[PDB]
Design a binder for this molecule. Sequence first.
Ligand SMILES: Nc1ncnc2c1ncn2[C@@H]1O[C@H](COP(=O)(O)OP(=O)(O)O)[C@@H](O)[C@H]1O
Ligand SMILES: Nc1ncnc2c1ncn2[C@@H]1O[C@H](COP(=O)(O)OP(=O)(O)O)[C@@H](O)[C@H]1O
Ligand SMILES: Nc1ncnc2c1ncn2[C@@H]1O[C@H](COP(=O)(O)OP(=O)(O)O)[C@@H](O)[C@H]1O
Ligand SMILES: [Mg+2]
Ligand SMILES: [Mg+2]
Ligand SMILES: [Mg+2]
Lengths: 205, 76, 525, 533, 536
Amino acid sequence: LAGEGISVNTGPKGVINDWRRFKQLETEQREEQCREMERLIKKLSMFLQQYRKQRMEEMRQQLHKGPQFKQVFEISSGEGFLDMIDKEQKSIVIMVHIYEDGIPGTEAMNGCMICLAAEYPAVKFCKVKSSVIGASSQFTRNALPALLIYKGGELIGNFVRVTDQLGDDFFAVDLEAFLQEFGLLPEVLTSVRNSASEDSDLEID
Amino acid sequence: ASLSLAPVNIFKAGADEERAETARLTSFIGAIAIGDLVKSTLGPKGMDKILLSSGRDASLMVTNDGATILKNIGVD
Amino acid sequence: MMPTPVILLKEGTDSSQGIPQLVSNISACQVIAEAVRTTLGPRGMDKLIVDGRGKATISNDGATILKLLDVVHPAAKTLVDIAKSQDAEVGDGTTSVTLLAAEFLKQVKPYVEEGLHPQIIIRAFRTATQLAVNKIKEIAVTVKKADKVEQRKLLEKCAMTALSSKLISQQKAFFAKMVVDAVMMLDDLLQLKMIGIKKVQGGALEDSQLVAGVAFKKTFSYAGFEMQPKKYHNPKIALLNVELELKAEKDNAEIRVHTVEDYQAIVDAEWNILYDKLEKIHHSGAKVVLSKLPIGDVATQYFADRDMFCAGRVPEEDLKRTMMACGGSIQTSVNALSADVLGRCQVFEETQIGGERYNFFTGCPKAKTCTFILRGGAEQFMEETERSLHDAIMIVRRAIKNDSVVAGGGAIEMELSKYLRDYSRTIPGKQQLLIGAYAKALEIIPRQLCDNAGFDATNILNKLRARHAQGGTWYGVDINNEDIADNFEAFVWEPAMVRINALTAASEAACLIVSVDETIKNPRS
Amino acid sequence: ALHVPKAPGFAQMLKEGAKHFSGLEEAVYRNIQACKELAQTTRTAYGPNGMNKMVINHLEKLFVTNDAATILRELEVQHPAAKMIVMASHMQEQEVGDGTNFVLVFAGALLELAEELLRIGLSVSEVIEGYEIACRKAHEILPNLVCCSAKNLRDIDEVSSLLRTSIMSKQYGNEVFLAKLIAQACVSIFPDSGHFNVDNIRVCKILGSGISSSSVLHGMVFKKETEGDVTSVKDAKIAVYSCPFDGMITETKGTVLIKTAEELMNFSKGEENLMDAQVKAIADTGANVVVTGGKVADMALHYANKYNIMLVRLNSKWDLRRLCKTVGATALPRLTPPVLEEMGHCDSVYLSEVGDTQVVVFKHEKEDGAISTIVLRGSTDNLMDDIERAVDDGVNTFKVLTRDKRLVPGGGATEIELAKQITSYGETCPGLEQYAIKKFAEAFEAIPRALAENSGVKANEVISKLYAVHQEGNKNVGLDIEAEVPAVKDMLEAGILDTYLGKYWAIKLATNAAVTVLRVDQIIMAKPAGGPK
Amino acid sequence: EGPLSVFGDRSTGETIRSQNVMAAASIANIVKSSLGPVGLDKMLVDDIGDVTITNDGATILKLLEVEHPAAKVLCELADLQDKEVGDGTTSVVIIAAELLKNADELVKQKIHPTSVISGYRLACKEAVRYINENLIVNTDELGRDCLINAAKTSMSSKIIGINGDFFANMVVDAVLAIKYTDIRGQPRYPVNSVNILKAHGRSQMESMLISGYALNCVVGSQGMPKRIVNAKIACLDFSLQKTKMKLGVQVVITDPEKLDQIRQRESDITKERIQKILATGANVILTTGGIDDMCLKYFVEAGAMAVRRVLKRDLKRIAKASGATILSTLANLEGEETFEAAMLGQAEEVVQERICDDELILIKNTKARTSASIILRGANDFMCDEMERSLHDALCVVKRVLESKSVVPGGGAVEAALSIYLENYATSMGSREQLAIAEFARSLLVIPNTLAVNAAQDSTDLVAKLRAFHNEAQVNPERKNLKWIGLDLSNGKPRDNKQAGVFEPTIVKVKSLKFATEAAITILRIDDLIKLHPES
Ligand SMILES: Nc1ncnc2c1ncn2[C@@H]1O[C@H](COP(=O)(O)OP(=O)(O)O)[C@@H](O)[C@H]1O
Ligand SMILES: Nc1ncnc2c1ncn2[C@@H]1O[C@H](COP(=O)(O)OP(=O)(O)O)[C@@H](O)[C@H]1O
Ligand SMILES: Nc1ncnc2c1ncn2[C@@H]1O[C@H](COP(=O)(O)OP(=O)(O)O)[C@@H](O)[C@H]1O
Ligand SMILES: [Mg+2]
Ligand SMILES: [Mg+2]
Ligand SMILES: [Mg+2]
C-alpha cells in the first residue's frame, strides 16, 4: 500500500470531456440549490383606525380596468423560474407566489395578486407551485403562503406564513396595505393604442 | 501505547496520526515522488513539462524550471 | 379516559397525580443528590462537566456542579435552588443542603407510600427543624473576650476547615492565613469586589501571593511605553477618568473657517488643548498616571519624555481597587488635581509574572483592599482554586459577623440526632416516627464522610452514637486516623450559621416537595 | 350503501374545520362535563389542607402553588365553557382578591345539579329561574349570618387575628408570623383617611435565609447599587429628578459651531464649569441624596462625589413615583435646585447587602409613611413567590375589611347554614322551581365536602354532624381540621372567619357563570387556525 | 467501548442493583392494588380487542409483556406459586419485591450481600419454624366449618366474594365428592377432575353443581334420543368410520367380480363392530374419534346416544367415575374381536340439557364412584372467566386445607406475629445478620400495610395496633390468645381472625415465604449486567 503521491498526470486531460459534461449538469443543479435556500431554514424550519379610505379603495379597485382581468403567470419548471428571474431589468421588482392547491387562503391571495397586477402595470406578479420547486416537506406542510420578492435579484421581502398577520379572508386592500407598511410597493385610459425608420418630417430645404 | 492504537480515542473527527515506521514511509514516499517528478528535466538533454491547470481559467504552462513545476502542483 | 369531542386542556398536556408522582419526586431528588454525593469531606472528589460547546469545568463545589447540570425535573430543581440559596447566604455547605434534603425525603418515603397524610410529615419536619436550630444556637461555642489573636486562630481554623475538601487542601495553612489577612483588610462592609483575584498561567500553588495593594495586567501599551521607567520609590498616582488623545472636541461639534490662518489656529488649538491637559497632569506632581479611557500614543510619549508612567483602558474594578488601596479619587477632569486627590503608594513596579506583565502597587499602609494572584498549570485548576478561596473568604466574613462555631465532621449532627431522638421518645407516637426519621436522616453526613473515605460506615456510626449517648458533644469522624475523635479539639470548626442555614433550607425544600400532590406540564410553545 | 352523506342545509355549508354542536345532550351536557372536569382538577387545593400543584406553562416557567386563580391562569384552558368559568373566577379575584376556589367549586356543583335536573325532566328556563330565585334568597339570608365585625383597623393584634384566616388556607403550617408581618405592613399604611391602597404595599424577594427571617420595612428597598462613592447617609435630603443627571440638550438638533480657536479651547472648560455650578447649586440646598430617573454623566458623577452626594439611579418611572410618594419629594423635570417644599426627607438612606444582593434602603424610624415594604427571605424562588401570593391575599383581605367590616363564620359553617335555610325556603314554594331551589341549596354542600376530603376524613359524617348541630340552633359551627376523626367545633370562638363581602361576591359571580353556561344552546366553533397570542 | 471490547452494554455497582430493585418494585406495584377483600380487579386489553378482567396475580403477570430479567424472575415466581399452591400469588410477589428492596437498602449501607443472604436464610428458617410451632390451627377441632371459612376467605377479593355463603358450600361439596383413597391410606383429593363449564345467562346464584359429569358436547345425529333413563355407557378411544386399509396394504384387482365384495366389506367391518358393541345393551357411546354418518344411522336405529370427538381427559374422567373401561380397540387375548358387557359404565341418567341457546350433555349420578362438575352462569363471558379463575383458586385452597390439616389466621396476623418474633430474635445472631433479619421482619409487614392501604384506611395506626397486640401476646404468657388478632377491613380495626373465620392453608404461607426468600436471594446475588446487542 504505497504510492501516496499518485500524480494522475495524463489521466485528466484525456477525460476532461466527460468531467466537464458532468460538471455542466452539476452547475445547473448548483445554481438551483443556491437560489432555493434564500428563504429556507432561516425562517422556514422555524376612530382613525377604522380606515374608511380602504372601502373606497376597494370600490375603485373593482373598476380597475376594462379590457380584461388577466391571470397571474404560472411557472412550469425550475429552469423557467431561473431564466425569468435572471432576465428582465433589475430596476423593476418581481414577486413570486408559492402555493399548493387544496390549502385554504390560496385563492384569496391569488385574487389579491390579480387585482394588484391590474392596478400596477410595472409589477410582474407571478406564481409557482410548491411541488414543482421541490421544496422540503416542512415547507409543503406548514409554509403554504410564501410571497418572495425579487428587486434586482435579491430579497427585500421574505414574507412566509402570512396567514397570521393577514387572516384567511383578506382582500386586495389588506394585502396592499400590509406590503406598503414596509415600503414594498413602488408609487389615464387610451382608446386602444397609439404606438405605430426615424425620418420624421422636413420642409423645402 | 500509541495514541491511535489505544482503547480510548484522543483526537477529533478527521484527525490522524502516524507513528515511526508509518511517518517515515510517508515522508520517504513524498520526497521520492517529488524527486522523480522534477528529475528527467535535468542537464542539457532534460525535457520539459506541461502544467495543465484544473481551474476555471485552465492556464497552460510549458516549462523546464524545477521551481515553477514544484510550486504549480497540488501537494498533500 | 373517555374522548370528549372537544377536550378541556390542550392536547399533549401531561398530568401526574397522587402517591406515584410524589414517589417519583423523591426518586428524582435522590438522583440529584447522588450527582454530588462523592464531593463531600476531605476525601471528596471532583466532577468534570462538559457543556455543549466543548468547554469543560472541574469543580468540587456542590452549587457549581448542580448549576452545570441542566435539571428540568420540577421537583429536582428545588435541590438546585436550595444549593444556590446556601451558596448565596453562607457560601459553604452547598453539598450538605442537598444531601440533607434528599435524606429527609428518602426517610419519609416509606410513610408516604403507605398513605400517610403529607401535612403530618410537614408539621413534623417544621417542629424538628425548629428544635434543631434552637439546639444549635444553644450549644454553639463562642468566645466573648474580643481578643485579637484568639479571633485570628478562630478565623484561621474556620478557613482551614472550609478549605479541607478541595485540590488546594494540601496547602490549607498558607491559603487560610492569606484569606484571613485579606478579609481583615476590608474595613466594615466586606465587599467581595474589594478582594481582587488574578489568575496567571504557570507556577505552583506555593507561588501564589497576596499583595497589600492592587495589581492588574498591562493594558495595551502604545508606542513609546517601553521608554517609561518601570519602578518608582515614592510615586504619587493620578487616578483619572479621562481620554488623553487627539480627537474631536465633541461628537456634534463642527468647525467653520474661511482663512488659512484660522485653519492653522484651529490645529494649534487642538494640540494646545491636549498639551494643556497633559501639562496639568504633569504639574500635579504625579509620577504614575492611570486612566479609565484610552491614553493615546502622543500622551504616552509625552509622559515618557517626563519619566512618567501611563496606563490606559484600566478596568473600572481595578481603578476602584487602586483608589481604596492608595487613597485618591477618580477624577473625570484634570482642572483641579490637588494633593488630596492623588493616590500615594510606597512602591510601584511592573514585573514579569508567568509570561505576563503586571503592575504592582505595594506598600500601602492604609489600604482597604488586596489582590490575590493565583498560579497553576491549567485554567480549570485556577477556576477551582478561585472557587475554594471564595468559599474560605465567605466563611471568614461570616465568622467576622458572628464568632460562634460548632465542631464539624458530623459531630454537630450526631448530637442533634441524639437530642431529636430523646425528644421524640416523649410524644404520643404519630409524630414520634417522623421525628425519629428526621433524626436518622441527620446521620447522612458522617456516613457519607466515611463512605467517601472508604471506611466502614456502620462501625464508625455505632461508635459515634454510643459516644454521644454516654457524653461528648463534639466527637466526630476522624478521617486520617480511621476512627472517631474530638473534632472541637481537632480544630475542625465551622460557623453555626452554616449548619443553621443548611437545616433550614433542607427542611424548606423537603416540605415544599412533599406538599405537591399533582404536577401538570403544558405543551411547549 | 357504504357512506352517510352530510345532510342538506347547514351541515353541507359548514366550513372544513368548523364544528357545530346543537341540542341538549350535544352542547349543554358537554359544557357541564367540561366545567365538572375543571372544578375537579382545581378541587384538591381548597382549604388549609390544600395541596400545592406544580404547573409548568408553555414557557417552561414553574409555578407551584395552591391559589386557584393562579392555577387557572397558568393552565391554558381550551374549552369555551371552562374559559367562561375561568373568567368568572378571575373577575372574583379582581373584585375581592380571595374566593376564586369557592367560585369554581360552587359553579361546578351548580352545573352538575343542573345536568341532573335536566335529566330528570326539567327544562333550562325553569332551572335558570329556580337558580336565580335561590340566589336572591341566599343574598337576602347572608347578612343575617354575619357574626362579628372588625370594629378596629389600627390595632396590630386585631388586624393580625382577622387576617390569619385568609392566609391560613395558603401556608397553613406557619400563618401567625405572616399574619403579624402583613398586619404591621398594612397598619403602617392606611392613615386617618379611610382610603387604603393595596399598591402602597411593596414586596421584596431576597433569597437565602428562610421565611422566618422575613421583616417589614417602613420605606422602599431597591435591588441596585449607588453610582457614587458615598454609600451611607444619616439625615437624607433626597432630591428626585425625572431628568437624567446631565446637562440638558436641545431637542431638534444640537450642533456646536466653532469659528475661532478661542471658542474651541474654551468650550469644554465652559461646559465643565457650568455643570460644576449646577451640581454645587443643588448641593447648597442641603441635599445629600440625589435620585435620577435617567443616565448619569461622568462629569456629573465626578462633581457629585466631590460634594459628597449620594447617587441612586432608578430606571423605571413607577419606582421613581413610589419613592417620591414614600419620601415626600417632587420629581423635578429640570436640574434646578429643589425648593424647600419639594425636598424629600428620609430618616436614613444607606447601601446594604442582604444575602448576596446589594440593596439601597430608604428607611424611616417612624411607624408611618406612604409606602411600606415587606422583605421576604427564603431558600427557593417558588417558595418566595407563594409567600408573596399569600401576602397579596392578606392585603386584599385587609382592603375588603376596610370596605366592609362584616364577617361570617368560615370552615363550612356559612355554607351549611345557607344550604339549610334555602332548603327550608324551597319547601314552601310550590311549582317546578322548588327542585331547582333545592338543588341550589344542596350545591352549598360542596364546600364542607371539599374541606373534609382535603383534611382526610369522611365528608358524609361531617355533613351529617353539621346538619344536626345547625338543627340544634348553633349556626357558627364548622369542621375541625385538627382531628383524625370527623368532628365539628364553633368557628366564632376559634377565630376562623372570612369576609362577608367576599362570600357575597363569590356567590353572585358563581351563580351568574352557571346561569350563563346553562343559557347557551348552540355552539358554532370556528377553525382554530393560528394566532399564538 | 473502552478496553473490555464487548458488543453490548454493561452496568456495574449500585446502578444494576438499583435497576433490578426498580424492576421488582414495578412488578409489585402492578398488582399491589388487587390484594385483600377491598382489592379491585383489573382490565387487560390484548391490543387486538380481546379483554380479560381478572384479580389473580399469576394471570396478570402472565398476560403482561415483560423485558427486564428481574421482572421476568418475579413473573416466573408468580407462575410457580400458582402451579404449586394456587393461592397467595399476589402476596408472594409483593413479599419478594419488598424483601429485595430492603436488602438493597441494607447493601447500599456497605453491608456485604453475603451477610444479607445469610440473614435472610436464617430469618426464613426461623419464620417457618415459628409458624409450624405456634401459629398453626388443627382443623380437626372445627370439622366442616373450617373448610367453609377457608373457601369463603379465598372467595374474598374475587368477583364471587359476596356470594361466598353459597359458593363456598358448592366448593366444599364438589371437593368432597371427588375424594378417593389410594395406597398408604392417604386420602388425596384430585382437583382438576372437577369439570368447570362456563355459560353466560342467569345470575351467579343459578350456578349448578352437577352430581355427576358435564360434557361440552352434543349428540352426533338429530335423530338420536336425548335422554336415557338407565345409561349403559361404552367408552371408545377409536373412531367409527368406513375402514381404510393401511399404507402398507394395497388393493389390486385382476378379476372384476371381487370389487363389489371388497367395497361391501369395507363398510361391513364397521357395521359388525357397531353391532357387537350394541349387542351387549350399550345405551350411550362416547368416542374420542369421529363417527361416520352410516354409524350414526346405526346408533339412531338402535335407539342409543352416540357422542363423537369427546376430549380424552373428559372420556377418562367419565370412564373412571362410571366404572367403564377405555377401549382403544376390540381385540381380546384369543385373537378375536369382541365387546364385553362387563366393561360398560353405568349412570342413572344422561340428558342433553339446554343452557342459554347452547346444549350440552349431563351424566347424572354415576355409580361406583362419585364425580362432580360445576356450570357457571354470569352476565357475559368475561365475568364467567373470572368466576372460573376464582373457583379454581377456592378449589385449590380447599384441597390444601383437606390434605394438610393445619391452617393459620388470615388478615395479616401471621405477618405481624412473624415481624415481632423475628425482630426480637435477631438480637442473638451475628452482627450484620442482625440487621438482615430485622429487615426481613420489617419487610414481612408489607402485607397488612397493603391491605389497609387498599381500604383507604390509616395503615400506620392499624399496623401499630397489630404490632402492639402481637408484642403483648409474645411477651405475656397468659395472653397467648392474641396471636389470632388480625385485620378487619370492613371497619378498619384489629379483630380476632380465628373467631372471625378468616383462615388460610399453612402451606400457602410457608411456600410463599420460601419462594420469596429464594427469589430475593437470586436477584440480590447479582452486581453486574452485560447486555449483548442482538445479532441484527
Ligand atoms: N478535617 C476534617 N475532618 C473531618 N470532617 C471534615 C474535615 N473538614 C471538613 N469536614 C466535613 O466535611 C463536610 C463537607 O465540607 P466541604 O466538602 O468542605 O464543603 P460542603 O459542606 O460545601 O460540602 C463538612 O460538613 C465538614 O463537617
Ligand atoms: N382552620 C380552618 N379550619 C376550617 N376551615 C378553614 C380554616 N381556615 C380556612 N378555612 C376555610 O377555607 C376556606 C378558604 O379556602 P381557600 O383555599 O382560601 O379558597 P380561596 O383561596 O378561593 O378563598 C374558607 O372558606 C374557610 O372557611
Ligand atoms: N375476610 C377477610 N378479612 C381480612 N383479611 C382477609 C380476608 N380474606 C382474605 N384476607 C387477606 O387478604 C390477603 C390477600 O388475599 P388475596 O390477594 O385475595 O389472595 P392472593 O394473594 O392469592 O391473590 C390474604 O393474605 C388474606 O390473609
Ligand atoms: Mg466546604
Ligand atoms: Mg382564599
Ligand atoms: Mg388469593
